């Protein structure tokens, strides 16, 4: 019965994340003056599947200078930890869920760095080591982003925890700043503007690259679950399309930081907020 | 009631308020600091009880803080003073192992910090050698107080596993024969931490 | 526009879909809906208590 | 607005100046300082809680509910004249 | 209970993997995946966050700067006589000596345990931390303090 | 066997380092605020205090002068001997009056309707 | 995992306990409260997915022989790893306080932690090390 | 604490010198201690209970059939 | 190559977790053995203190 | 003669002890570089970590979690001050070594 | 200068800080002053359990 | 051996209410004896009066009030031993058995 | 903390009645073991039937019914 939950879970991840990519490409077409996908399939519907099966019987390119084992290591692990977090988020009752998912979220730059290692290229080298410093960077806020959320989750019997089910099912009102450094945590994690300066799948063809897109938009539903359950008041199909939309309508509009900019803004802003944040809601709960 | 705590929070206020003096000293290119040195001495004599050998400790370490100069070196000798001192008054074997690895971690970054002309890789190399060699003797300490812990149930430092935690300490003295990491130290790091 | 209108409406039902089919999947393997909510020491004495006893009368409904 | 900042300035050798010397109040295209409490809070509003990314914002999402530009090829054709 | 018990005894096996192969990048990554399957084996002694603090300092922290130290200072010489020297004999006597035979175990004279899951509480945790042991908390901030100095103390200019 | 059912709201009432005495004295106020701690303090902590401070406002200047920056660093000499004397004369006035010290002074002074 | 001793199966005699057991589903409202079994299996059909993914493009794609085609087309981060490595140990000790009812004399000792953290933090900050110029 | 300990003498000479890990324990947690049952209370009470088992006032030992 | 090492790993992971079994098993048959001696020897040794302890 | 929870806790104790020795000796014994050298001290605190919270389950008892969050910062603590002084070792004498950072061969 | 120059000063070169550290300091003081102040102010089982259902069964 | 056993845990709840009420003498009697002796074999007769008493309340609620008490439990056992959320038959429940003898 | 201080409360109703169920089916087990043994150990000379350990204070199983591992 576990594997048939976590396979009828698997289904409407991998469908939503076809749907996902479609719809980004439409949305950001309707932003700027024209349609976007409409040729392929009726209304452009089957665009992502022919992407699929197009790279499905692309040739793999296995480069014969690098070692093919960290190489085709790197995309696996990054989708089987964007599976194992959707899991993580529907398929579990544990005490401290939100710590999973964000133990299960610090573990996925392993991929990056595996990729920057394994090919043979000199951006390559320099790009990953970009990408995980941004992610590495923005991933302390996201703790102690937890850290203010967690002071005030509280079960019928009395535990503290970070167990989904007894979250609150009213908007967070007095964490709108919170919030809102939360959703541009998200936006620095999945490295989409204006942080999409880093790229690290240069050498990566055919369903390997299929296997990268896939883990960053599962990635990227995973922290839109958890940013609708911390501070939206549930999880819910209607608010997973309504992030989604504000991340491409976001897309649409802004340039992108240079690194040491938003390396400063990291480090400089986010990070003590947070924290100072932390210390005023510690002082309320007492 | 925390009132019998004061020298505690006085400790912890200190130092807190020794870094940002620092800060502040430095944003005005002072080439010298005699006056956080000063700050650091009062510091040493604040913090200290009344016994005879907690006031030779300090006595000592007021003294030794004149052979150093820039802000780094002394809070590293201040925070490693805080487990040289409350190491005499550890009772178990939690607070023997931090007040222990608080020393080595500071020496270890003493040595690499204050190393300067052609003797700067020599004494990078005796701090790295120090450190590995330091590193497995804080395991086998570990290793035989969580032996001790799980046979007698308590924190009582009884028994066959007193002979290793006895090993751990002739290692700190520099004790033949396993004394080659002092005389590692000695032939390239500077006079005054040796 | 109207061309980003059926994918934006089609995550929606593959979510809502989705979710109703694996909340009737657990439902069936659970059979009571507060299986996911915390559950600290006592509560899962409670459980396992009740499990054991539950097994116990199985075990003595099949002796009469 | 096409005012500058000291903060805002895309280099370091400008950071640098700015916040060692007080040469920038004499350049006329600065924002200057706030004198009060109302022009502090309008200020912060300014830097903090954006409002310079929601406008762009509401001019995009105008866009997405306005007409498009695109012809469907080779139903529909562009526009030629005969010295083509 | 054979995959509980092969998941214990895999923890032994990648410990000696880790300085049995050549390459740094492999020592690394057995590494990681010992660290992995250790904080699994925790979670059978009923430890839920901290198997998760083990995951989360471990693998998630300390194992990207291995992972960076070593693609930026390791050129390939595993054939420059990383091969073609070998290893020390003496020292894997003094391996199988203490840890095969285990001539002198940390159990002493018993040999046999019965191991017990606990209950983790957190409460329990958070009162003992910040009640009961408060002086090593602190100590514990300071032994950090000196890491954050000293590494920036340290750092190559 | 079965364990009890757990208080999650109470907290244990324990200071990190125990006394291990019992107080051989009258017990005036067995916890003391800080308030109550100031407002029983004798004149000789103040005394002490103010000699800590000017101490440290002359040796601050003396050693701040050096890199000519007297003045401020006098000051924080002050401040820093002077709250060092400050928490010694708070922690003694609160030992006197929880009964750890000699209160003669303070138990004919503190109970204003239990003089005598 | 499956109870071993009379005294921890509740003191229920007999065989059918025992293969009920062993035989048992998953359950959270049963005998797996808190388990985290669920996260091993999906670690493993995850990993059949994908590599199922890396092998079939193997099989039906064309592919042709070329040696061009194999081939290639700062201290700052030391600062970012051990500062991330320090951070998330001190997040780690602050979690404990917040799964708490805390009293004040714990919120003070955790502001003391707190102190000591951000006057480390700032030092760096005024000195110019979170500057990332190089 | 519970790692470290202070000794100072006493000025008066009243205090008596002991373990200071028992003491501490003792202010700390406590020392629960249990008694046997004197027999004749136990057969007074088993006495008792089989009486009202018998009269009546008291049920089965399981709520099932 | 990768086939041979992935074939490698499996062979060993598989190895060691059916051989190390059989070591705790006879180190704990050894314990056994071992404590049943000692509690012989010591029933002995009460039943000569017995004897002429009166 | 021996039950189910028997050989689990030998298991474990077996398991550990080979741990230890295996962090302790191996990577010397293979003459291996210095970042082995810090993983493989690491090796040796994971194995001193598991022990403690074993014992802390054992026993019902505080003190081995207390143990194992202190030796976790104290083991990270090292490990980053090591790695500096490599790198900075490195840089100051790859002119003339190449092999810099094995000092067992 | 005064409080007001030097604070405008700092808030329009670097506003985030300054505000971070008013956030900290509201809730030092909200701890330190304000509580203490104005929000901070054996029966058997079955007391406590008919004061529960008195509880609840007006609402 | 004989099977002693109380109620699920669910109907413990559902009952808990009813226990002090009318079985609070057999509660004093266990605890104080708890308190005193630590071996289980020196509280026996305690123990199994009030296992007795608990049962004996058990078979009392079944011959008036059956299926308030059971839709109660019920609900209790849906909702994981919330009591927040079952009230509406907590209040069936008391009203069809009350939990003091009223009008005596 | 309302629901919390119901829910205590209830715990603390339950507790006695609990702690009673398990102290009377731990007893009719050792009953079933001593009978056991009984059965097994006749023919050895010197062998007490129900020899306890300790001397004055009673020793729990300990494994326990409500300590199971995670995974
Ligand atoms: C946080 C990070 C992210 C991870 C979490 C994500 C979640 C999990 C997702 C899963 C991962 C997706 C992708 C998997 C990779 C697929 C394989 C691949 O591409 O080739 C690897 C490939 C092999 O290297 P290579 O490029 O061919 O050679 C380069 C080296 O220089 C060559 O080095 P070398 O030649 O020196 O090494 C040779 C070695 C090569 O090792 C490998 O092949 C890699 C081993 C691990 C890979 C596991 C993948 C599947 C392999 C089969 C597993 C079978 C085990 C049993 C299963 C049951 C089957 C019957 O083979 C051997 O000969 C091994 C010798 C054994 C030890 C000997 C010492 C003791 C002697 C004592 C007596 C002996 C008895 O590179 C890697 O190892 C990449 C590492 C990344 C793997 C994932 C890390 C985590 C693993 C899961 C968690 C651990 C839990 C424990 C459970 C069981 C253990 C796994
Ligand atoms: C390591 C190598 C793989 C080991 C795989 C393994 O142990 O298989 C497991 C787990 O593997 C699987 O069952 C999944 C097989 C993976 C491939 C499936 C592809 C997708 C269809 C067997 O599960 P069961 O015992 O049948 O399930 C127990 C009952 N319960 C459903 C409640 C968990
Ligand atoms: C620029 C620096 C100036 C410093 C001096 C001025 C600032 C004032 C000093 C700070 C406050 C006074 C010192 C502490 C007062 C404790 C006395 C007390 O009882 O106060 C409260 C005690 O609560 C606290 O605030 C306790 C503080 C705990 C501090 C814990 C950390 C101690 C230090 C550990 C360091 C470890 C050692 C490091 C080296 C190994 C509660 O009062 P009450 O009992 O009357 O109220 C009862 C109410 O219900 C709450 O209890
Ligand atoms: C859907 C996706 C939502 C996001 C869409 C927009 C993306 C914008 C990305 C770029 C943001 C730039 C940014 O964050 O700038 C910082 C200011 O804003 C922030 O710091 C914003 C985050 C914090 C919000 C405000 C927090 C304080 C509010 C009041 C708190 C106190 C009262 C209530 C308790 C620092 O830029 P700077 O110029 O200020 O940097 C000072 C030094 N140059
Ligand atoms: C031939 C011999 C082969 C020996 C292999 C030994 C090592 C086993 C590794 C995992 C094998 C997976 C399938 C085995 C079944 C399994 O899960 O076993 C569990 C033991 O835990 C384990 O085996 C724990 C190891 C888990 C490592 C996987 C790491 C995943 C990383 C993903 C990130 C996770 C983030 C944190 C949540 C308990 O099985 P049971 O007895 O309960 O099952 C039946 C009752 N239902
Ligand atoms: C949780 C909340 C986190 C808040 C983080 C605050 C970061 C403080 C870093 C400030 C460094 C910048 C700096 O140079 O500050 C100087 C003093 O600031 C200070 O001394 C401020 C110290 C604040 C301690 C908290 C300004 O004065 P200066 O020394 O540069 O001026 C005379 C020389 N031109
Ligand atoms: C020629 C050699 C001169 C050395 C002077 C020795 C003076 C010893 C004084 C000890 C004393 O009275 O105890 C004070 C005091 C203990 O008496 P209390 O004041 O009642 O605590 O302890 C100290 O302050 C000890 C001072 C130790 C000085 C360093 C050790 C020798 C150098
Ligand atoms: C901002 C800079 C960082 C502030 C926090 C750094 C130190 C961490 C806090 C240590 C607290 C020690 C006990 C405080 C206490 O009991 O205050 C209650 C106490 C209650 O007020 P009362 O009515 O006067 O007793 O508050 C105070 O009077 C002190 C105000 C808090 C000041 C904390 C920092 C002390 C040094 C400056
Ligand atoms: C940077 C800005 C940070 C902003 C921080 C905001 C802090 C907000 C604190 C809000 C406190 C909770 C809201 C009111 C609930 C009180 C509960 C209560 O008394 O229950 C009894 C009672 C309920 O009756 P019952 O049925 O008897 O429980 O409620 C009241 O009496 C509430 C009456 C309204 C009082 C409103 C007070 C508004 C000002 C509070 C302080 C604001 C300034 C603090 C900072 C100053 C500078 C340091
Ligand atoms: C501007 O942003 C974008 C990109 O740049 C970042 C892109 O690169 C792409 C293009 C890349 C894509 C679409 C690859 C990622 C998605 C995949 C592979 C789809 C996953 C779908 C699955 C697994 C379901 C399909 C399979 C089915 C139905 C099974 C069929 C079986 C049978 C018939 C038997 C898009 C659309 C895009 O917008």
């Not at chain 2, 929070?9 to 006056?35: K, P, W």
């Not at chain 2, 907690?54 to 007021?62: G, K, Q, R």
């Not at chain 6, 364990?3 to 990190?16: L, Q, R, S």
Request: hydrophobic residues 50%; glycine residues 6%.
């Amino acid at each position: 019965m576990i594997v048939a939950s976590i396979l009828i879970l698997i289904v409407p991840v991998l469908l939503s994340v076809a749907m996902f990519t479609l719809a980004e490409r439409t949305v950001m077409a309707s932003m700027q003056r024209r349609f976007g996908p409409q040729v392929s399939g009726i209304s452009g519907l089957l665009q992502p599947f022919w992407d699929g099966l197009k790279l499905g019987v692309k040739e793999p390119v296995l480069p014969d200078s690098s070692s093919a084992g960290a190489f085709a290591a790197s995309p696996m692990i990054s989708f089987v930890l964007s599976q194992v977090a959707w899991v993580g988020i529907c398929i579990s009752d544990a005490s401290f869920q939100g710590l999973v998912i964000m133990a299960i979220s610090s573990l996925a730059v392993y991929g990056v760095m595996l990729a920057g290692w394994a090919s043979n290229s000199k951006y390559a080298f320099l790009g990953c080591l970009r990408s995980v410093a941004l992610m590495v960077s923005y991933e302390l806020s996201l703790g102690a982003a937890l850290l203010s959320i967690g002071l005030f989750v509280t079960d019928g019997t009395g535990m503290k925890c970070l167990n989904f089910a007894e979250m609150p099912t009213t908007p967070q009102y007095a964490m709108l700043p919170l919030c809102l450094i939360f959703l541009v945590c998200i936006l620095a994690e999945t490295k989409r503007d204006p942080f999409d300066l880093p790229g690290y799948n240069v050498e990566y063809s055919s369903l390997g690259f299929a296997l990268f897109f896939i883990a960053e938009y599962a990635n990227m539903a995973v922290m839109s679950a958890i940013a609708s359950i911390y501070f939206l008041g549930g999880f819910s199909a209607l608010k997973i399309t309504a992030l989604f939309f504000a991340f491409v309508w976001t897309r649409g509009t802004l340039p992108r930081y240079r690194y040491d900019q938003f390396m400063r803004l990291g480090w400089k802003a986010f990070l003590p907020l947070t924290l100072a944040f932390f210390a005023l809601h510690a002082s309320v709960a007492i | 009631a925390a009132a019998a705590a004061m020298i505690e929070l006085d400790l912890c206020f200190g130092l807190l308020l020794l870094i940002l003096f620092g800060l502040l000293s430095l944003r005005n290119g002072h080439v010298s600091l005699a006056h956080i040195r000063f700050i650091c001495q009062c510091w040493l004599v604040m913090i200290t009880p009344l016994e005879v050998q907690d006031f030779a400790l300090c006595i000592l370490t007021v003294v030794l803080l004149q052979s150093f100069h820039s802000f780094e070196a002394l809070l590293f000798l201040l925070l490693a003073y805080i487990g040289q001192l409350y190491m005499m008054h550890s009772c178990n074997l939690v607070s023997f192992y931090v007040c222990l690895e608080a020393q080595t971690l500071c020496v270890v970054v003493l040595c690499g910090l204050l190393a300067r002309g052609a003797s700067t890789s020599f004494s990078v190399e005796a701090a790295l050698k120090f450190l590995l060699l330091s590193a497995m003797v804080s395991g086998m300490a570990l290793f035989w107080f969580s032996a001790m812990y799980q046979r007698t149930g308590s924190l009582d430092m009884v028994g066959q596993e007193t002979f290793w935690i006895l090993l751990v300490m002739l290692f700190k003295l520099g004790v033949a024969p396993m004394h080659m990491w002092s005389v590692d130290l000695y032939g390239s790091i500077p006079k005054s931490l040796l | 526009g109207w061309n980003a209108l059926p994918s934006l409406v089609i995550i929606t039902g593959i979510w809502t879909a989705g979710l109703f089919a694996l909340d009737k999947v657990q439902m069936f393997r659970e059979n009571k809906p507060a299986w996911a909510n915390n559950k600290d020491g006592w509560q899962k004495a409670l459980y396992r208590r009740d499990w054991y006893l539950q097994r116990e009368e199985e075990t003595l409904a099949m002796a009469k | 607005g096409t005012e500058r900042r000291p903060g805002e300035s895309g280099a370091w050798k400008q950071i640098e100046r700015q916040r060692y010397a007080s040469d920038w109040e004499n350049d006329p295209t600065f924002k200057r300082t706030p004198k009060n409490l109302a022009e502090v809070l309008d200020d912060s509003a300014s830097m903090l809680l954006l409002t310079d990314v929601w406008r762009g914002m509401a001019y995009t999402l105008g866009a997405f509910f306005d007409k498009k530009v695109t012809i469907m090829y080779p139903f529909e054709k562009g526009q030629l004249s005969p010295r083509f | 209970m054979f995959f509980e018990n092969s998941a214990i005894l895999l923890c032994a096996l990648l410990s000696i993997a880790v300085g049995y192969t050549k390459s740094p990048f492999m020592s690394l990554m057995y590494s990681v995946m010992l660290f992995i399957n250790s904080s699994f084996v925790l979670m059978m002694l009923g430890f839920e966050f901290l198997a998760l603090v083990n995951l989360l300092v471990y693998v998630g922290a300390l194992a990207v700067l291995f992972l960076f130290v070593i693609m930026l200072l390791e050129i390939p010489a595993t054939e420059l006589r990383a091969y073609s020297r070998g290893w020390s004999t003496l020292g894997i006597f003094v391996f199988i000596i203490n840890g095969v035979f285990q001539i002198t175990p940390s159990m002493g004279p018993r040999g046999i345990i019965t191991g017990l899951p606990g209950a983790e509480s957190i409460t329990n945790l958070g009162h003992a931390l910040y009640l009961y042991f408060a002086d090593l908390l602190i100590l514990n901030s300071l032994v950090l303090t000196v890491a954050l100095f000293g590494r920036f103390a340290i750092a190559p200019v | 066997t079965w364990p009890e059912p757990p208080n999650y709201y109470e907290a244990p009432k324990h200071g990190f380092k125990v006394t291990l005495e019992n107080p051989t004295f009258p017990i005036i106020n067995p916890d003391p605020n800080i308030t109550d701690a100031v407002t029983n303090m004798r004149s000789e902590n103040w005394g002490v205090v103010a000699g800590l401070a000017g101490l440290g406002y002359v040796a601050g200047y003396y050693f701040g002068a050096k890199v000519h920056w007297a003045k401020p660093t006098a000051l924080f000499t002050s401040i820093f001997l002077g709250k060092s004397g400050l928490l010694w004369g708070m922690s003694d006035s609160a030992h006197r009056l929880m009964g750890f010290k000699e209160n003669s002074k303070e138990v004919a002074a503190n109970l204003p309707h239990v003089m005598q | 995992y499956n109870a071993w001793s009379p005294a921890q199966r509740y003191f229920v005699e007999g065989d059918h306990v025992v293969t009920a057991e062993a035989s048992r589903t998953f359950q959270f409202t049963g005998l797996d409260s808190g388990s985290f079994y669920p996260y091993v299996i999906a670690t493993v059909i995850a990993t059949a997915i994908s590599t199922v993914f890396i092998v079939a493009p193997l099989v039906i794609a064309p592919s042709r022989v070329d040696l061009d085609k194999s081939s290639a087309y700062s201290v700052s981060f030391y600062l970012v790893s051990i500062m991330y490595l320090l951070f998330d140990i001190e997040i780690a000790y602050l979690f404990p306080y917040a799964m708490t009812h805390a009293s004040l004399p714990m919120y003070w000792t955790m502001n003391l932690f707190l102190a000591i953290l951000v006057a480390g933090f700032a030092y760096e900050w005024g000195m110019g090390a979170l500057e990332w110029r190089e | 604490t519970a790692g470290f300990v202070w000794r100072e003498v006493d000025p008066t000479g009243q205090a008596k010198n002991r373990n200071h890990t028992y003491m501490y324990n003792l202010k700390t947690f406590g020392h629960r201690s249990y008694t046997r049952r004197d027999p004749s209370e136990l057969q007074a009470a088993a006495t008792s209970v089989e009486a009202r088992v018998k009269s009546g006032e008291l049920g089965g030992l399981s709520p099932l059939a | 190559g990768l086939i041979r090492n992935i074939a490698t790993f499996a062979t060993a992971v598989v190895g060691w977790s059916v051989g190390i079994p059989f070591v705790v098993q006879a180190r704990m048959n050894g314990y056994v053995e071992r404590n049943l001696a000692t509690y012989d020897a010591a029933q002995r040794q009460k039943a000569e203190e017995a004897a002429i302890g009166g | 003669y021996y039950t189910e929870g028997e050989i689990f806790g030998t298991t474990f104790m077996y398991t550990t002890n080979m741990m230890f020795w295996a962090g302790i000796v191996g990577a010397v014994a293979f003459r291996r570089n210095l970042i082995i050298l810090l993983l493989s001290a690491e090796t040796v605190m994971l194995a001193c970590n598991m022990n403690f919270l074993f014992t802390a389950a054992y026993l019902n008892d505080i003190t081995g979690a207390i143990m194992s969050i202190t030796i976790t910062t104290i083991a990270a603590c090292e490990t980053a001050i090591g790695l500096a002084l490599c790198v900075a070792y490195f840089h100051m004498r790859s002119a003339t070594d190449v092999e810099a950072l094995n000092m067992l061969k | 200068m005064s409080l007001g120059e030097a604070f405008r000063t700092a808030v329009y070169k670097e506003p985030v800080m300054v505000w971070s550290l008013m956030i900290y300091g509201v809730g030092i003081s909200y701890a330190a002053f304000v509580k203490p102040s104005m929000i901070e102010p054996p029966p058997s089982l079955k007391e406590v359990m008919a004061g529960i259902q008195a509880k609840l069964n007006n609402k | 051996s004989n099977t002693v056993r109380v109620p699920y845990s669910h109907e413990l709840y559902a009952m808990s209410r009813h226990v002090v009420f009318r079985a609070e003498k057999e509660h004093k009697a266990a605890v104080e004896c708890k308190g005193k002796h630590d071996w289980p074999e020196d509280c026996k007769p305690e123990s199994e009066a009030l296992v007795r008493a608990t049962n004996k309340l058990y078979k009392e609620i079944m011959e008036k009030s059956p299926e308030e008490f059971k839709e109660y439990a019920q609900c209790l056992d849906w909702y994981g031993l919330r009591f927040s959320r079952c009230r509406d038959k907590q209040t069936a429940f008391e009203k069809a058995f009350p939990i003091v003898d009223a009008k005596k | 903390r309302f629901e919390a201080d119901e829910i205590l409360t209830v715990r603390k109703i339950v507790h006695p009645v609990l702690q009673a169920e398990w102290d009377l089916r731990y007893l009719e087990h050792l009953k079933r073991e001593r009978e056991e043994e009984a059965k097994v150990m006749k023919n050895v000379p010197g062998w007490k039937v129900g020899e306890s350990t300790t001397r004055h204070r009673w020793l729990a199983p300990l494994e326990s019914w409500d300590k199971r591992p995670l995974v």
